[PDB]
Amino acid sequence: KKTFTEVQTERLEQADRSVLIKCPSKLNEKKLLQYLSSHGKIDNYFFFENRGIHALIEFSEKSSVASLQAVTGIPKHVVPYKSRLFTFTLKNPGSQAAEERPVKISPQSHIPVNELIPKLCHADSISSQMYILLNEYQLTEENIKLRYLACSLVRDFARAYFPDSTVKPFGSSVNTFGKLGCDVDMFLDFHKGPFEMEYQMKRLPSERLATQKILSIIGDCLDNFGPGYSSVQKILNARCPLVKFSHQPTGFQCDLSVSNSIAIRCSELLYIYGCLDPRVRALVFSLRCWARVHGLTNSVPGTWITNFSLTMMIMFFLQKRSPPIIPTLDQLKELADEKDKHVIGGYDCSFVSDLSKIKPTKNTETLDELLCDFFQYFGNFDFRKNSLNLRKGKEVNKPESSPLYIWDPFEQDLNISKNVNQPQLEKFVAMARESAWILQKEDKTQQMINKEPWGLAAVLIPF
Amino acid sequence: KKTFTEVQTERLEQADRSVLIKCPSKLNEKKLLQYLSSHGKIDNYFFFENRGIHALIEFSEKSSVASLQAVTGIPKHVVPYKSRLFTFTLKNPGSQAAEERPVKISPQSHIPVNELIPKLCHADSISSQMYILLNEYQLTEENIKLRYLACSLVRDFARAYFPDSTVKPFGSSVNTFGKLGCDVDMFLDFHKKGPFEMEYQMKRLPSERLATQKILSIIGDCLDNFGPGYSSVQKILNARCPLVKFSHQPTGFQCDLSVSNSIAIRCSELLYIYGCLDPRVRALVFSLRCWARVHGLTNSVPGTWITNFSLTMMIMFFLQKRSPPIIPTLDQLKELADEKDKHVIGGYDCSFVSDLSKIKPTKNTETLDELLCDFFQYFGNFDFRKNSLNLRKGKEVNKPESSPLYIWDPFEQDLNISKNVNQPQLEKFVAMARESAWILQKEDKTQQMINKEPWGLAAVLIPF
Ligand SMILES: Nc1ncnc2c1ncn2[C@@H]1O[C@H](COP(=O)(O)OP(=O)(O)OP(O)(O)=S)[C@@H](O)[C@H]1O
Ligand SMILES: Nc1ncnc2c1ncn2[C@@H]1O[C@H](COP(=O)(O)OP(=O)(O)OP(O)(O)=S)[C@@H](O)[C@H]1O
Ligand SMILES: [Mg+2]
Ligand SMILES: [Mg+2]
């Protein structure tokens, strides 16, 4: 089985030797690939629709990019920054010499709620509803390659002066809980004679200020040299210095931070839980959707619960099952060799990487029960006295006054849901309580017969 | 003699395979070159003094740089940008007192005025004074290699984002009129089987002016934050020519980085021709540049003052007007230019002969004694209010615009290169020329030598 870190390395290596080609108006697929193949073998490719037809081409060898860049020219007022974004037109527009087939468009966004509801209503069980949702919403192989490519393009800027750099995606994009249309969270990562011979190199300041200057410049580069980047927003003074930007070629909204290797460990953690049992993913997607539908989450930050916080609450829920659906963080820590040992900023972030080594769950609860039980469980959870600990998998006394306390499983000084206020917590608790009520006391078979919402769909519409 | 463009290409190729090594405190020359030679043959090298001992090493093969970079490490924080700047220390510092010869230091600056004056007084003719000055002030072979290396390093740096880039020096650094301690003017220059026209996505901007501004702004910041040796980085992006100024500590040069101004190069080649044509040309410019500085007619900061470039062009016009001319007019060079020497840039014709052998050598035989005094006499009595200087025609013509001092930009015509100059400064110039000419005419040379006093060039190179 593929370990998180193996998958990152592979995906990055693939995106490394990938390019984006704005295709001709009247397009011939075969002639294009035949032509491109002349520069080297093509492992994968696909087409998508983003203000015209674009194609992602993944070569087998990185040299194929160089080869292809050789024959590529500048449109003779531009900034001559040469990246892996191409525009292909015909030399002789009047030499079209084959039948026109239509190309398959890989979708890059999910169907909206209003269209999803019908499909859910026409399913058999609530279990199947959640799996329909999961399939309609989850990242596709294509979308993923496109996410890693975005990172790969941003990497190329940074390497100008930090040659060993990488830009690594973290968060929902890579932890199996990613849905179509979600943002790409990126962080920039940096790691004889009679003479001692050293390069002269400019010293940097302390961590935080170096970060700020590096991002400020890279931001400006994206804004001024980089094709496709718009709405570049420097938020350098946050707790984690950050640059936000929109990347039009791939259509992703993006977040670029520096060197937070703790967040990665948690992204790997969530990846494990996501990979362990398909019910885990199914449940997160439906409940993330639920939260959005009732206005418990928001696109902008504030007093609301966040998807990440909500996700962690769901992980705690699954830890508490009889028997558990997923092990505690400590239980993974207990199975970690010294090769899986990582200590970062003083904090232990050690846990098993190999998935085979984990004892598969004996739990057999259906998603029907788990969904309603989630609403029941947190609807009757004493938030004022108890806090969520994912290391121990137990309710414990709150170390601090905060309406909703969830123990940051790595930087254990912290409350990840610290932002949440009492009002929003209560609106969450009331929605859970109403939600659980609806599922318990609804007459399923009659709703189907009446052409009405039931199960998942019933709770995925405003009250 | 080689052609401007041939010389640039060669100098750049040499600087391409050159490096800088901050040397040990107690240095052994032989052991160092012996060691460095292991990585490949060394065509040239020398040492200079810039806050400690540095050495320039020019290998015969570019691979020697790669070889040497292989064994070089990072100082164990820093920006890991690997360039051609090295620091060499001793593994066992207290196991040797092997001081070198001590090593010869190639000077990189000229002696000051106060020391130069004696040497001038001690010469025979005014002609010889000017040539002493010329030799004391002009660029040395070493300083030149160091200038091209600066450009070569900035090139590599720029090439981080723009792999096909080149950085070319222009101005006094390469037009034969360069003196020790003058700034390095650089400009950044940019240089199908199958059924497809394949082209990059790039942002379409309004003018080429804006691209320039953004490219320099970023490169400036990169020099400031990531680049080794660069300090005092100043973005002057809104000038007539967008510019970044910076100090480069390894070579100790103050530098000016602009983008893609291939007109200025043509004028740098023009001045190179005039400089190469006759040694009196260079001699006269150096002495008169020095003269101007001494009397406060020029300044280090820009403003109402005449500039060295403007002053240089005035001297070129003077030499055009001789009987017979010491140098041909720009048009006369334009007339001798083949279609290979034809260049049209931004609409402007900048065509003129490159080959120096093709130009008719001057029949003029005036001595520098006469020319110097005649310069002061000529411009002291020049009607600046009516007449303007045209170096294409080599003639006084009516001023196209109200401006105290008008000199026709020989390429971008309908520009006045001395536009900045106001009436007061022009007059202070005219008065200094008039006094200067008077002193040379009515001075009793032999008596001044006998009296242990300044004479000729030295007489006019001290405040009045
Ligand atoms: N308070 C926090 N405490 C610990 N880690 C955090 C916190 N906030 C964000 N992170 C980490 O940063 C990653 C990305 O942040 P978010 O984009 O806000 O959330 P997300 O997991 O990516 O899900 P989305 O983007 O809302 S669908 C999270 O997955 C965490 O690894
Ligand atoms: N007012 C100007 N008008 C036209 N061209 C100019 C002007 N100023 C500078 N240039 C051009 O830029 C080149 C370099 O500018 P400068 O560094 O200011 O002068 P310079 O020739 O290097 O002599 P120095 O540095 O004063 S000794 C000049 O040789 C011109 O080609
Ligand atoms: Mg995210
Ligand atoms: Mg200069």
Residue numbers in the entry:
A (entry chain A): 51 to 126, 131 to 245, 256 to 527
B (entry chain B): 51 to 126, 131 to 245, 255 to 527
Cite, word for word, the article reporting this structure:
The homozygous p.N478D missense mutation in MTPAP causes spastic ataxia autosomal recessive Type 4 (SPAX4), a severe progressive neurodegenerative human disorder characterized by profound muscle-tone abnormalities and optic atrophy. The mutation diminishes mtPAP's polymerization activity, leading to an alteration in poly(A) tail lengths of representative mRNA transcripts, which dysregulates post-transcriptional expression and results in a pathogenic lack of key respiratory–chain complexes. In chicken mtPAP, the corresponding residue is N472. To confirm that the reduction in poly(A) tail length in N472D mtPAP was not caused by compromised ATP binding, we solved the crystal structure of the N472D mtPAP-ATPγS complex. The structure was virtually identical to the WT-ATPγS structure with a well-defined density for the ATPγS and no changes in the conformations of the surrounding residues. However, the second adenine ring, which takes the presumed position of an aligned incoming 3′ RNA base in the WT structure, was missing from both protomers in the N472D mtPAP–ATPγS complex. By itself, N472 does not determine specificity toward ATP, but its mutation to aspartate is implicated in the human SPAX4 disease phenotype characterized by drastic shortening of mRNA poly(A) tails. We propose that N472 plays a role in the precise positioning of the incoming 3′ nucleotide of mRNA in relation to the bound ATP, which is required for polymerization, and that the N472D mutation could disrupt the regular substrate-nucleotide alignment and cause a reduction in poly(A) tail synthesis. Observation of the density for the second adenine ring in our WT but not in the N472D-ATPγS structure supports the prediction that upon RNA binding and slight domain closure—N472 but not the D472 SPAX4 disease mutant—would form hydrogen bonds bridging and aligning the two adenine rings.
In mitochondria, mRNAs are polyadenylated by mtPAP. In our work, we purified an active form of chicken mtPAP and determined the crystal structures of the mature wild-type (WT) enzyme (residues 37–568) alone and in complex with ATPγS, UTP, GTP and CTP substrates to 1.82–3.1 Å resolution. The purified mtPAP crystallized as a dimer as observed in solution. mtPAP consisted of an N-terminal domain (NTD: 52–194 aa) and (using the domain nomenclature of the DNA Pol β family) of palm (195–341 aa) and fingers (342–527 aa) domains. The palm domain is composed of three α-helices (α6–α8) and a mixed five-stranded β-sheet core (β5–β6–β8–β9–β10) that forms one wall of the active site and harbors the catalytic triad conserved in all members of the Pol β family: D237, located at the base of β6; D239 on strand β6; and D319, which belongs to β10.
